[PDB]
Amino acid sequence: AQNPNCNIMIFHPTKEEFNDFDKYIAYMESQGAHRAGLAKIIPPKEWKARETYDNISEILIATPLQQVASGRAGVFTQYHKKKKAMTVGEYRHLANSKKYQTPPHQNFEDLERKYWKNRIYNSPIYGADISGSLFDENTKQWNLGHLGTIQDLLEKECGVVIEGVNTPYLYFGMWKTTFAWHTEDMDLYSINYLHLGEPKTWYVVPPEHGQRLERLARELFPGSSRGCGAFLRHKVALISPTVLKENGIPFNRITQEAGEFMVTFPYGYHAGFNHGFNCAEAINFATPRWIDYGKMASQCSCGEARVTFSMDAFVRILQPERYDLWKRGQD
Ligand SMILES: Cc1ccccc1S(N)(=O)=O
Ligand SMILES: Cc1ccccc1S(N)(=O)=O
Ligand SMILES: Cc1ccccc1S(N)(=O)=O
Ligand SMILES: Cc1ccccc1S(N)(=O)=O
Ligand SMILES: O=C(O)CNC(=O)C(=O)O
Ligand code: NI
Ligand SMILES: [Zn+2]
């Protein structure tokens, strides 16, 4: 078996290899990339997402989210407090202010140390889940707004036509902005392009070991666990690499820089943080191998987890028994 230690693999496709998205994902998996839960793809030197990022300051962040932590330095939850709208230009200025700017540091490792030591004592503001794209319409390869849809994949594989659409989302981050431990909706893949700015550090648990992380989370967040059988779907829980090591949870880490893609694989739990002002674009996607994961995906039915409209059809077709209880939850 390829990649038995479940290491994060890094790929450097040629421009010829970059022409067929589906084929390249399949190639990565033939090399065992999915076993890690996460892969990095560095695009060919000839490729570009767009010409420049010069005129993005007028994008609106309608609902910036202040990420307020509770708990201990290595085991905490965060909740999102809504703030007044601001443009990307205003947000960038805020990110760079004395209150919010990245502190002096020696290297990525030093910054990582500072993040886990001090994250809980600050409340950075994140511009997350903004529908839109920064890919030039003329960028034909790996354009996250031009991927085959999950609905079309499910139709190709299962012969059923369903309603729904899926489109990309933009994320504007600053120092300490955090993504909590989670897998994707329906345990889909995700792909994430860092368009500009400072890096993003990722942590990931191999899909074959996801239940180990779930068991630890139930122990560390006992009230949350009693409230919901799939509370990680709420996307609020953080556990540090030190705490993971102390509890024998297998995981890896890698830092993504501007101009690089990351792919998360079905049922690959991931979490992370931004180093400073940045902008990423991400979208979910599927392949034939996803279908079996979609059929088995846990669901939140306590009401907390947000459902896109399109998730309805996925649950209805792949999980008809659960459909009753789940739909009562989102209503
Ligand atoms: C950038 C480039 C240039 C020539 C052929 C193909 C490409 S690609 N696949 O878009 O990266
Ligand atoms: C609020 C909090 C804080 C730290 C650990 C666990 C929790 S929770 N959501 O009560 O399980
Ligand atoms: C538990 C821990 C904590 C920090 C560094 C290393 C470890 S260990 N003994 O390698 O799992
Ligand atoms: C023990 C160790 C050390 C470094 C990175 C990851 C691990 S773990 N918890 O074995 O995956
Ligand atoms: O970038 C972020 O804040 C979170 N991104 C993801 O979880 C993803 O791309 O799957
Ligand atoms: Ni994700
Ligand atoms: Zn729930």
mmCIF file of C-alpha atoms and ligand atoms in Angstrom:
data_model
loop_
_atom_site.group_PDB
_atom_site.id
_atom_site.type_symbol
_atom_site.label_atom_id
_atom_site.label_comp_id
_atom_site.label_asym_id
_atom_site.label_seq_id
_atom_site.Cartn_x
_atom_site.Cartn_y
_atom_site.Cartn_z
ATOM 1 C CA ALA A 1 0.000 0.000 0.000
ATOM 2 C CA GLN A 2 1.196 3.500 -0.896
ATOM 3 C CA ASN A 3 2.017 6.047 1.829
ATOM 4 C CA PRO A 4 1.447 3.698 4.799
ATOM 5 C CA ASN A 5 2.610 6.265 7.386
ATOM 6 C CA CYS A 6 -0.052 8.685 6.036
ATOM 7 C CA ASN A 7 2.339 11.579 5.372
ATOM 8 C CA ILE A 8 1.212 14.812 3.731
ATOM 9 C CA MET A 9 2.419 14.681 0.129
ATOM 10 C CA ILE A 10 3.474 17.663 -1.996
ATOM 11 C CA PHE A 11 2.937 17.642 -5.772
ATOM 12 C CA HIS A 12 4.504 19.688 -8.570
ATOM 13 C CA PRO A 13 2.349 19.027 -11.665
ATOM 14 C CA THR A 14 3.701 20.063 -15.061
ATOM 15 C CA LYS A 15 1.565 22.403 -17.143
ATOM 16 C CA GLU A 16 0.500 19.387 -19.223
ATOM 17 C CA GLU A 17 -0.507 17.476 -16.077
ATOM 18 C CA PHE A 18 -2.444 20.534 -14.857
ATOM 19 C CA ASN A 19 -4.894 20.326 -17.776
ATOM 20 C CA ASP A 20 -7.088 17.542 -16.387
ATOM 21 C CA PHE A 21 -8.226 18.140 -12.811
ATOM 22 C CA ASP A 22 -10.007 14.806 -12.266
ATOM 23 C CA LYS A 23 -7.104 12.845 -13.733
ATOM 24 C CA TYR A 24 -4.600 14.572 -11.447
ATOM 25 C CA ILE A 25 -6.647 13.964 -8.295
ATOM 26 C CA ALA A 26 -6.835 10.287 -9.279
ATOM 27 C CA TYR A 27 -3.059 10.283 -9.829
ATOM 28 C CA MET A 28 -2.407 11.757 -6.365
ATOM 29 C CA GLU A 29 -4.556 9.022 -4.829
ATOM 30 C CA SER A 30 -2.708 6.324 -6.809
ATOM 31 C CA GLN A 31 0.367 7.527 -4.903
ATOM 32 C CA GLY A 32 -1.461 7.306 -1.552
ATOM 33 C CA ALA A 33 -1.968 11.050 -1.030
ATOM 34 C CA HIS A 34 -5.468 10.643 0.430
ATOM 35 C CA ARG A 35 -4.174 8.554 3.343
ATOM 36 C CA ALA A 36 -2.867 11.753 4.971
ATOM 37 C CA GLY A 37 -6.215 13.548 4.690
ATOM 38 C CA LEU A 38 -4.474 16.555 3.093
ATOM 39 C CA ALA A 39 -2.142 17.226 0.123
ATOM 40 C CA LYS A 40 -0.324 20.315 -1.199
ATOM 41 C CA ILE A 41 -0.275 21.100 -4.922
ATOM 42 C CA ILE A 42 2.187 23.682 -6.215
ATOM 43 C CA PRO A 43 0.979 24.889 -9.632
ATOM 44 C CA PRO A 44 3.277 25.018 -12.700
ATOM 45 C CA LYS A 45 5.390 28.178 -12.983
ATOM 46 C CA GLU A 46 3.518 29.098 -16.181
ATOM 47 C CA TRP A 47 0.128 29.215 -14.416
ATOM 48 C CA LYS A 48 -1.582 32.125 -12.683
ATOM 49 C CA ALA A 49 -4.935 32.568 -10.955
ATOM 50 C CA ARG A 50 -5.319 36.140 -12.218
ATOM 51 C CA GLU A 51 -3.148 39.034 -13.426
ATOM 52 C CA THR A 52 -2.991 41.079 -10.205
ATOM 53 C CA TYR A 53 -4.748 41.596 -6.888
ATOM 54 C CA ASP A 54 -4.725 45.391 -7.276
ATOM 55 C CA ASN A 55 -8.448 46.103 -7.274
ATOM 56 C CA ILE A 56 -9.885 43.843 -4.556
ATOM 57 C CA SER A 57 -10.199 46.443 -1.802
ATOM 58 C CA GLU A 58 -13.840 47.188 -2.624
ATOM 59 C CA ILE A 59 -15.064 43.649 -1.939
ATOM 60 C CA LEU A 60 -17.477 43.766 1.015
ATOM 61 C CA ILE A 61 -17.245 41.559 4.085
ATOM 62 C CA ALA A 62 -20.910 41.881 5.065
ATOM 63 C CA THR A 63 -20.564 39.995 8.348
ATOM 64 C CA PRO A 64 -17.038 39.906 9.806
ATOM 65 C CA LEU A 65 -16.799 37.374 12.657
ATOM 66 C CA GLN A 66 -14.956 38.045 15.925
ATOM 67 C CA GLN A 67 -13.620 34.694 17.154
ATOM 68 C CA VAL A 68 -13.928 34.630 20.934
ATOM 69 C CA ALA A 69 -12.295 31.705 22.792
ATOM 70 C CA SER A 70 -13.237 29.860 25.994
ATOM 71 C CA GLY A 71 -11.260 27.149 27.771
ATOM 72 C CA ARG A 72 -7.559 26.457 28.125
ATOM 73 C CA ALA A 73 -4.664 27.279 25.801
ATOM 74 C CA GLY A 74 -4.560 23.812 24.246
ATOM 75 C CA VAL A 75 -8.252 22.828 24.535
ATOM 76 C CA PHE A 76 -10.798 25.523 23.773
ATOM 77 C CA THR A 77 -13.926 26.413 21.867
ATOM 78 C CA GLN A 78 -14.585 29.565 19.883
ATOM 79 C CA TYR A 79 -17.798 31.363 19.124
ATOM 80 C CA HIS A 80 -18.405 33.871 16.375
ATOM 81 C CA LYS A 81 -19.640 37.331 17.331
ATOM 82 C CA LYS A 82 -21.020 39.276 14.370
ATOM 83 C CA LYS A 83 -19.500 42.684 13.637
ATOM 84 C CA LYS A 84 -20.481 45.563 11.349
ATOM 85 C CA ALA A 85 -19.742 45.298 7.625
ATOM 86 C CA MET A 86 -16.406 46.469 6.267
ATOM 87 C CA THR A 87 -14.617 46.441 2.923
ATOM 88 C CA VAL A 88 -11.545 44.303 2.272
ATOM 89 C CA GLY A 89 -9.488 47.522 2.326
ATOM 90 C CA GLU A 90 -10.798 48.379 5.789
ATOM 91 C CA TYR A 91 -10.256 44.779 6.952
ATOM 92 C CA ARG A 92 -6.646 44.759 5.692
ATOM 93 C CA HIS A 93 -5.964 47.990 7.592
ATOM 94 C CA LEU A 94 -7.470 46.452 10.735
ATOM 95 C CA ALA A 95 -5.378 43.270 10.307
ATOM 96 C CA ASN A 96 -2.219 45.384 10.092
ATOM 97 C CA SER A 97 -3.036 47.542 13.135
ATOM 98 C CA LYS A 98 -1.006 47.260 16.338
ATOM 99 C CA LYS A 99 -3.876 45.433 18.064
ATOM 100 C CA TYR A 100 -4.151 42.657 15.462
ATOM 101 C CA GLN A 101 -0.851 42.449 13.553
ATOM 102 C CA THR A 102 1.425 39.394 13.572
ATOM 103 C CA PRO A 103 4.044 39.728 16.351
ATOM 104 C CA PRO A 104 7.809 39.649 15.795
ATOM 105 C CA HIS A 105 8.938 36.033 15.409
ATOM 106 C CA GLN A 106 11.974 34.025 14.327
ATOM 107 C CA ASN A 107 10.361 31.514 11.925
ATOM 108 C CA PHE A 108 7.157 29.466 11.307
ATOM 109 C CA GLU A 109 7.954 27.267 14.348
ATOM 110 C CA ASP A 110 8.271 30.254 16.687
ATOM 111 C CA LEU A 111 5.010 31.673 15.349
ATOM 112 C CA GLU A 112 3.300 28.291 15.876
ATOM 113 C CA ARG A 113 4.520 28.262 19.496
ATOM 114 C CA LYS A 114 3.140 31.771 20.013
ATOM 115 C CA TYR A 115 -0.202 30.830 18.444
ATOM 116 C CA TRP A 116 -0.864 27.907 20.801
ATOM 117 C CA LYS A 117 0.449 29.755 23.843
ATOM 118 C CA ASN A 118 -1.530 32.969 23.327
ATOM 119 C CA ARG A 119 -4.476 32.383 20.934
ATOM 120 C CA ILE A 120 -7.114 32.258 23.648
ATOM 121 C CA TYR A 121 -6.191 35.710 25.004
ATOM 122 C CA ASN A 122 -7.173 37.501 21.781
ATOM 123 C CA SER A 123 -10.259 37.688 19.572
ATOM 124 C CA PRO A 124 -9.221 38.121 15.931
ATOM 125 C CA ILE A 125 -11.775 39.022 13.255
ATOM 126 C CA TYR A 126 -12.318 36.679 10.257
ATOM 127 C CA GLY A 127 -14.085 37.383 6.968
ATOM 128 C CA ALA A 128 -15.283 33.852 6.258
ATOM 129 C CA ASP A 129 -17.744 32.123 3.930
ATOM 130 C CA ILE A 130 -18.142 34.975 1.431
ATOM 131 C CA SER A 131 -19.699 33.697 -1.798
ATOM 132 C CA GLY A 132 -17.472 34.707 -4.706
ATOM 133 C CA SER A 133 -14.291 34.032 -6.693
ATOM 134 C CA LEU A 134 -11.005 35.763 -7.478
ATOM 135 C CA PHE A 135 -10.040 33.507 -10.396
ATOM 136 C CA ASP A 136 -9.884 35.274 -13.771
ATOM 137 C CA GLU A 137 -12.592 33.861 -16.054
ATOM 138 C CA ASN A 138 -9.816 33.250 -18.606
ATOM 139 C CA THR A 139 -7.934 30.953 -16.233
ATOM 140 C CA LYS A 140 -9.011 27.614 -17.615
ATOM 141 C CA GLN A 141 -7.150 25.166 -15.391
ATOM 142 C CA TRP A 142 -7.748 24.656 -11.656
ATOM 143 C CA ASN A 143 -10.246 27.524 -11.615
ATOM 144 C CA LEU A 144 -12.269 26.826 -8.477
ATOM 145 C CA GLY A 145 -15.371 28.412 -10.033
ATOM 146 C CA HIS A 146 -15.259 26.101 -13.081
ATOM 147 C CA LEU A 147 -15.121 22.656 -11.471
ATOM 148 C CA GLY A 148 -17.589 19.908 -12.265
ATOM 149 C CA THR A 149 -20.379 20.062 -9.699
ATOM 150 C CA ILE A 150 -21.071 17.566 -6.934
ATOM 151 C CA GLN A 151 -24.623 17.230 -8.248
ATOM 152 C CA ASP A 152 -23.290 16.209 -11.657
ATOM 153 C CA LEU A 153 -20.872 13.755 -10.033
ATOM 154 C CA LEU A 154 -23.715 12.114 -8.088
ATOM 155 C CA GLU A 155 -25.741 11.928 -11.303
ATOM 156 C CA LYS A 156 -22.842 10.386 -13.260
ATOM 157 C CA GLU A 157 -22.195 7.793 -10.552
ATOM 158 C CA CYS A 158 -25.706 6.963 -9.353
ATOM 159 C CA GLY A 159 -27.962 7.983 -12.247
ATOM 160 C CA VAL A 160 -30.139 10.334 -10.199
ATOM 161 C CA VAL A 161 -30.682 13.988 -11.044
ATOM 162 C CA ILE A 162 -30.912 16.349 -8.079
ATOM 163 C CA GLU A 163 -31.428 20.041 -7.383
ATOM 164 C CA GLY A 164 -28.662 22.177 -5.919
ATOM 165 C CA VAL A 165 -25.599 24.199 -6.814
ATOM 166 C CA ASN A 166 -22.156 24.578 -5.349
ATOM 167 C CA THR A 167 -20.025 27.666 -5.665
ATOM 168 C CA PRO A 168 -16.740 28.908 -4.175
ATOM 169 C CA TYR A 169 -16.252 30.923 -0.990
ATOM 170 C CA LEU A 170 -13.674 33.577 -0.105
ATOM 171 C CA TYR A 171 -11.939 33.825 3.280
ATOM 172 C CA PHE A 172 -10.141 36.936 4.471
ATOM 173 C CA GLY A 173 -7.943 36.204 7.487
ATOM 174 C CA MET A 174 -5.606 37.887 9.940
ATOM 175 C CA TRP A 175 -3.143 36.748 12.614
ATOM 176 C CA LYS A 176 -4.697 34.091 14.901
ATOM 177 C CA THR A 177 -7.868 33.628 12.869
ATOM 178 C CA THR A 178 -8.713 29.990 13.333
ATOM 179 C CA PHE A 179 -10.505 27.102 11.668
ATOM 180 C CA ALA A 180 -11.791 24.517 14.156
ATOM 181 C CA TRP A 181 -11.427 20.722 13.861
ATOM 182 C CA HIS A 182 -13.846 19.435 11.199
ATOM 183 C CA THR A 183 -14.449 17.302 8.152
ATOM 184 C CA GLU A 184 -16.379 18.701 5.181
ATOM 185 C CA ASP A 185 -20.179 18.575 4.861
ATOM 186 C CA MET A 186 -21.121 15.003 3.806
ATOM 187 C CA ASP A 187 -17.402 14.194 4.199
ATOM 188 C CA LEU A 188 -16.729 15.778 0.795
ATOM 189 C CA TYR A 189 -13.319 16.792 -0.516
ATOM 190 C CA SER A 190 -12.302 20.428 -0.361
ATOM 191 C CA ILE A 191 -9.808 22.421 -2.374
ATOM 192 C CA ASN A 192 -8.325 25.661 -1.066
ATOM 193 C CA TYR A 193 -6.223 28.203 -2.971
ATOM 194 C CA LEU A 194 -4.263 30.840 -1.019
ATOM 195 C CA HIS A 195 -4.572 33.843 -3.358
ATOM 196 C CA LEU A 196 -2.461 36.364 -1.472
ATOM 197 C CA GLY A 197 -0.860 37.381 1.778
ATOM 198 C CA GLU A 198 0.559 35.559 4.771
ATOM 199 C CA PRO A 199 0.593 31.765 5.257
ATOM 200 C CA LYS A 200 -1.988 29.354 6.648
ATOM 201 C CA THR A 201 -0.888 26.465 8.915
ATOM 202 C CA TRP A 202 -2.889 23.218 8.710
ATOM 203 C CA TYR A 203 -3.209 20.205 11.037
ATOM 204 C CA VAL A 204 -4.781 16.963 9.754
ATOM 205 C CA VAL A 205 -5.731 13.500 11.025
ATOM 206 C CA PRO A 206 -5.597 10.574 8.546
ATOM 207 C CA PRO A 207 -9.120 9.491 7.498
ATOM 208 C CA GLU A 208 -8.417 5.931 8.676
ATOM 209 C CA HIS A 209 -7.913 7.357 12.193
ATOM 210 C CA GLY A 210 -10.708 9.942 12.322
ATOM 211 C CA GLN A 211 -12.641 8.065 14.992
ATOM 212 C CA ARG A 212 -9.661 8.395 17.357
ATOM 213 C CA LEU A 213 -9.974 12.172 17.154
ATOM 214 C CA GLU A 214 -13.740 11.915 17.699
ATOM 215 C CA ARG A 215 -13.256 9.825 20.854
ATOM 216 C CA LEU A 216 -10.773 12.334 22.283
ATOM 217 C CA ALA A 217 -13.080 15.233 21.416
ATOM 218 C CA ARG A 218 -15.929 13.545 23.313
ATOM 219 C CA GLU A 219 -13.656 13.300 26.369
ATOM 220 C CA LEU A 220 -12.381 16.902 26.104
ATOM 221 C CA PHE A 221 -15.742 18.563 25.389
ATOM 222 C CA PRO A 222 -18.134 16.477 27.481
ATOM 223 C CA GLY A 223 -21.078 18.917 27.588
ATOM 224 C CA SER A 224 -20.910 19.426 23.824
ATOM 225 C CA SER A 225 -20.802 15.681 23.275
ATOM 226 C CA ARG A 226 -23.910 15.123 25.397
ATOM 227 C CA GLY A 227 -25.729 17.792 23.387
ATOM 228 C CA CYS A 228 -25.004 16.361 19.943
ATOM 229 C CA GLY A 229 -23.755 13.048 18.555
ATOM 230 C CA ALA A 230 -21.793 14.884 15.862
ATOM 231 C CA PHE A 231 -20.809 18.113 17.600
ATOM 232 C CA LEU A 232 -17.580 18.550 15.614
ATOM 233 C CA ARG A 233 -19.979 19.510 12.796
ATOM 234 C CA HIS A 234 -20.518 22.728 14.794
ATOM 235 C CA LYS A 235 -16.952 23.752 13.871
ATOM 236 C CA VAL A 236 -16.084 25.287 17.235
ATOM 237 C CA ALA A 237 -13.565 22.945 18.930
ATOM 238 C CA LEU A 238 -9.771 23.355 19.025
ATOM 239 C CA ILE A 239 -7.180 20.892 20.332
ATOM 240 C CA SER A 240 -3.456 21.706 20.150
ATOM 241 C CA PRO A 241 -0.733 19.482 18.644
ATOM 242 C CA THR A 242 0.722 18.999 22.151
ATOM 243 C CA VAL A 243 -2.608 17.679 23.446
ATOM 244 C CA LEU A 244 -2.951 15.436 20.384
ATOM 245 C CA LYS A 245 0.522 13.952 21.046
ATOM 246 C CA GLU A 246 -0.279 13.480 24.749
ATOM 247 C CA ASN A 247 -3.308 11.422 23.740
ATOM 248 C CA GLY A 248 -1.672 9.410 20.959
ATOM 249 C CA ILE A 249 -3.736 10.893 18.120
ATOM 250 C CA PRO A 250 -1.986 10.480 14.761
ATOM 251 C CA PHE A 251 -1.722 13.784 12.871
ATOM 252 C CA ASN A 252 0.459 15.869 10.583
ATOM 253 C CA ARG A 253 1.043 19.560 9.986
ATOM 254 C CA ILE A 254 2.050 21.705 7.028
ATOM 255 C CA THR A 255 2.113 25.402 6.160
ATOM 256 C CA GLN A 256 0.471 26.663 2.945
ATOM 257 C CA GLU A 257 1.894 29.785 1.273
ATOM 258 C CA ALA A 258 0.447 32.212 -1.282
ATOM 259 C CA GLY A 259 0.102 30.625 -4.716
ATOM 260 C CA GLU A 260 -0.419 27.079 -3.401
ATOM 261 C CA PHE A 261 -3.420 24.738 -3.411
ATOM 262 C CA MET A 262 -4.376 22.373 -0.599
ATOM 263 C CA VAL A 263 -6.790 19.461 -1.056
ATOM 264 C CA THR A 264 -8.583 17.820 1.864
ATOM 265 C CA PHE A 265 -9.797 14.261 1.337
ATOM 266 C CA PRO A 266 -13.067 12.636 2.488
ATOM 267 C CA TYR A 267 -13.216 12.274 6.280
ATOM 268 C CA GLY A 268 -9.853 13.998 6.799
ATOM 269 C CA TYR A 269 -10.278 16.068 9.974
ATOM 270 C CA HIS A 270 -8.435 19.375 9.745
ATOM 271 C CA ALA A 271 -7.869 22.596 11.725
ATOM 272 C CA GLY A 272 -5.512 25.538 11.475
ATOM 273 C CA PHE A 273 -4.707 29.224 11.682
ATOM 274 C CA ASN A 274 -3.637 32.213 9.600
ATOM 275 C CA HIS A 275 -0.265 33.954 10.074
ATOM 276 C CA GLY A 276 -1.440 37.457 9.128
ATOM 277 C CA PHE A 277 -3.582 39.209 6.516
ATOM 278 C CA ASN A 278 -4.497 36.837 3.700
ATOM 279 C CA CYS A 279 -7.178 35.758 1.249
ATOM 280 C CA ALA A 280 -8.098 32.169 0.369
ATOM 281 C CA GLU A 281 -10.767 30.685 -1.914
ATOM 282 C CA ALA A 282 -12.258 27.232 -1.312
ATOM 283 C CA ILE A 283 -14.952 24.900 -2.596
ATOM 284 C CA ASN A 284 -16.149 21.350 -1.984
ATOM 285 C CA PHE A 285 -15.928 18.716 -4.708
ATOM 286 C CA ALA A 286 -16.524 14.994 -5.207
ATOM 287 C CA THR A 287 -15.034 12.024 -7.075
ATOM 288 C CA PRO A 288 -16.321 8.462 -7.502
ATOM 289 C CA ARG A 289 -14.397 7.424 -4.361
ATOM 290 C CA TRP A 290 -16.350 9.978 -2.298
ATOM 291 C CA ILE A 291 -19.723 8.251 -2.706
ATOM 292 C CA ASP A 292 -19.030 5.604 -0.043
ATOM 293 C CA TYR A 293 -17.962 8.304 2.437
ATOM 294 C CA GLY A 294 -21.039 10.405 1.692
ATOM 295 C CA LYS A 295 -23.276 7.401 2.500
ATOM 296 C CA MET A 296 -21.626 6.981 5.903
ATOM 297 C CA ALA A 297 -21.149 10.620 6.946
ATOM 298 C CA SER A 298 -22.300 11.563 10.426
ATOM 299 C CA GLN A 299 -24.863 14.328 10.741
ATOM 300 C CA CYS A 300 -25.697 17.011 13.267
ATOM 301 C CA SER A 301 -29.415 16.962 14.088
ATOM 302 C CA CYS A 302 -29.359 19.101 17.250
ATOM 303 C CA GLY A 303 -29.855 22.139 15.039
ATOM 304 C CA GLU A 304 -26.525 23.892 15.590
ATOM 305 C CA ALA A 305 -24.748 22.931 12.363
ATOM 306 C CA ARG A 306 -25.566 25.046 9.317
ATOM 307 C CA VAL A 307 -26.956 23.355 6.225
ATOM 308 C CA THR A 308 -26.634 24.638 2.737
ATOM 309 C CA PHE A 309 -29.713 24.055 0.622
ATOM 310 C CA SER A 310 -27.713 21.640 -1.509
ATOM 311 C CA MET A 311 -26.918 19.305 1.378
ATOM 312 C CA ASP A 312 -30.616 18.340 1.513
ATOM 313 C CA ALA A 313 -30.429 16.313 -1.690
ATOM 314 C CA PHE A 314 -27.222 14.569 -0.618
ATOM 315 C CA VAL A 315 -28.849 13.334 2.606
ATOM 316 C CA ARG A 316 -32.113 12.508 0.814
ATOM 317 C CA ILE A 317 -30.463 10.258 -1.795
ATOM 318 C CA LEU A 318 -27.442 8.843 0.076
ATOM 319 C CA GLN A 319 -28.956 8.607 3.570
ATOM 320 C CA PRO A 320 -32.725 8.166 3.155
ATOM 321 C CA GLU A 321 -33.200 6.670 6.643
ATOM 322 C CA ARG A 322 -31.559 9.658 8.305
ATOM 323 C CA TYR A 323 -33.392 12.145 6.098
ATOM 324 C CA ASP A 324 -36.410 12.420 8.454
ATOM 325 C CA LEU A 325 -34.476 13.148 11.655
ATOM 326 C CA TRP A 326 -31.931 15.364 9.908
ATOM 327 C CA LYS A 327 -34.494 17.537 8.124
ATOM 328 C CA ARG A 328 -36.304 18.113 11.414
ATOM 329 C CA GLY A 329 -32.985 19.486 12.647
ATOM 330 C CA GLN A 330 -32.453 22.098 9.954
ATOM 331 C CA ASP A 331 -36.075 23.196 10.342
HETATM 332 C C1 LIG B 1 -0.078 27.814 -17.779
HETATM 333 C C2 LIG B 1 -0.138 26.872 -18.944
HETATM 334 C C3 LIG B 1 0.596 27.169 -20.087
HETATM 335 C C4 LIG B 1 0.551 26.325 -21.172
HETATM 336 C C5 LIG B 1 -0.217 25.186 -21.140
HETATM 337 C C6 LIG B 1 -0.959 24.880 -20.018
HETATM 338 C C7 LIG B 1 -0.922 25.717 -18.912
HETATM 339 S S1 LIG B 1 -1.879 25.299 -17.478
HETATM 340 N N1 LIG B 1 -2.355 23.775 -17.548
HETATM 341 O O1 LIG B 1 -3.063 26.107 -17.443
HETATM 342 O O2 LIG B 1 -1.100 25.491 -16.291
HETATM 343 C C1 LIG B 2 -17.180 25.792 26.447
HETATM 344 C C2 LIG B 2 -16.133 24.722 26.557
HETATM 345 C C3 LIG B 2 -14.843 25.139 26.869
HETATM 346 C C4 LIG B 2 -13.821 24.228 26.996
HETATM 347 C C5 LIG B 2 -14.068 22.886 26.820
HETATM 348 C C6 LIG B 2 -15.343 22.455 26.518
HETATM 349 C C7 LIG B 2 -16.386 23.358 26.374
HETATM 350 S S1 LIG B 2 -17.989 22.701 25.980
HETATM 351 N N1 LIG B 2 -18.603 23.325 24.639
HETATM 352 O O1 LIG B 2 -18.875 23.011 27.064
HETATM 353 O O2 LIG B 2 -17.909 21.276 25.853
HETATM 354 C C1 LIG B 3 3.418 13.621 24.360
HETATM 355 C C2 LIG B 3 4.421 14.469 23.631
HETATM 356 C C3 LIG B 3 4.388 15.845 23.834
HETATM 357 C C4 LIG B 3 5.286 16.667 23.195
HETATM 358 C C5 LIG B 3 6.237 16.139 22.353
HETATM 359 C C6 LIG B 3 6.293 14.776 22.145
HETATM 360 C C7 LIG B 3 5.389 13.934 22.778
HETATM 361 S S1 LIG B 3 5.498 12.189 22.467
HETATM 362 N N1 LIG B 3 6.086 11.436 23.755
HETATM 363 O O1 LIG B 3 6.410 11.978 21.382
HETATM 364 O O2 LIG B 3 4.204 11.667 22.146
HETATM 365 C C1 LIG B 4 4.420 11.629 18.223
HETATM 366 C C2 LIG B 4 4.279 12.630 17.111
HETATM 367 C C3 LIG B 4 5.329 13.523 16.921
HETATM 368 C C4 LIG B 4 5.277 14.471 15.927
HETATM 369 C C5 LIG B 4 4.173 14.554 15.111
HETATM 370 C C6 LIG B 4 3.116 13.685 15.288
HETATM 371 C C7 LIG B 4 3.155 12.719 16.284
HETATM 372 S S1 LIG B 4 1.762 11.629 16.435
HETATM 373 N N1 LIG B 4 0.799 12.057 17.642
HETATM 374 O O1 LIG B 4 2.256 10.294 16.606
HETATM 375 O O2 LIG B 4 1.022 11.718 15.211
HETATM 376 O O1 LIG B 5 -9.370 28.428 5.219
HETATM 377 C C1 LIG B 5 -10.176 28.250 6.163
HETATM 378 O O2 LIG B 5 -10.455 29.115 7.019
HETATM 379 C C2 LIG B 5 -10.866 26.917 6.283
HETATM 380 N N1 LIG B 5 -10.724 26.115 5.084
HETATM 381 C C3 LIG B 5 -11.119 24.844 5.058
HETATM 382 O O3 LIG B 5 -11.520 24.253 6.069
HETATM 383 C C4 LIG B 5 -11.086 24.128 3.790
HETATM 384 O O4 LIG B 5 -10.602 24.656 2.759
HETATM 385 O O5 LIG B 5 -11.568 22.982 3.786
HETATM 386 NI NI NI B 6 -12.486 22.439 5.621
HETATM 387 ZN ZN ZN B 7 -25.300 19.351 16.567
#
